[PDB]
From Swiss-Prot:
One Gene Ontology biological process: actin filament debranching
Coiled coil: none
Any one GO MF annotation of this record: growth factor activity
Listed InterPro entries: ADF-H, ADF-H/Gelsolin-like_dom_sf, GMF
Modified residue annotations for N-acetylserine: S8
Protein name from the UniProt record: Glia maturation factor gamma
Keyword annotations of the record: Acetylation, Growth factor
Regions crossing the membrane: none
């Protein structure tokens, strides 16, 4: 992690909207049993993270399509992993949608509030996708299984 440059230690960290905070607490304990995703954004007007969209019964291939191509935002995908003996749990993870074609003025808004939004949802698993394309059934199940491959 050398490639890159920095200067001052401060960003435009945003708060965790009250209307959203619940969305997370509920998502983690929702009355569902399928794969669902939650895309949240940050309003520059209220410098606070607010829900943007919520899709249910969607695969790791559709979410990537729902995401933009040059706009940073938060995304909480809930996959369903099975065992074998007859046990299946849904390992909720935090998918940070951060493309390489967006502006450094916005990306920061999410890069600085990311920890805040995540910490709010209480997600022990957080991943960063360099691009929607990355968000693939595999690239996803790979992180859950047991860490990705190299890097």
């Amino acid at each position: 992690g050398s490639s890159g440059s920095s200067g001052s230690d401060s960003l435009v960290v945003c708060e965790v909207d009250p209307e959203l905070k619940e969305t997370l607490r509920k998502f983690r304990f929702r009355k569902e049993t399928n794969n669902a995703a939650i895309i949240m954004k940050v309003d520059k007007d209220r410098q606070m993270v607010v829900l943007e969209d919520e899709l249910q019964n969607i695969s790791p291939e559709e979410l990537k399509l729902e995401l933009p191509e040059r706009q940073p935002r938060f995304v909480v995908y809930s996959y369903k992993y099975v065992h074998d003996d007859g046990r299946v749990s849904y390992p909720l993870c935090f998918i940070f949608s951060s493309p390489v074609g967006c502006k450094p003025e916005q990306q920061m808004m999410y890069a600085g509030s990311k920890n805040r939004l995540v910490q709010t949802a209480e997600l022990t698993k957080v991943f960063e996708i360099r691009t929607t394309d990355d968000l693939t059934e595999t690239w996803l199940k790979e992180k859950l299984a047991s860490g990705p491959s190299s890097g």
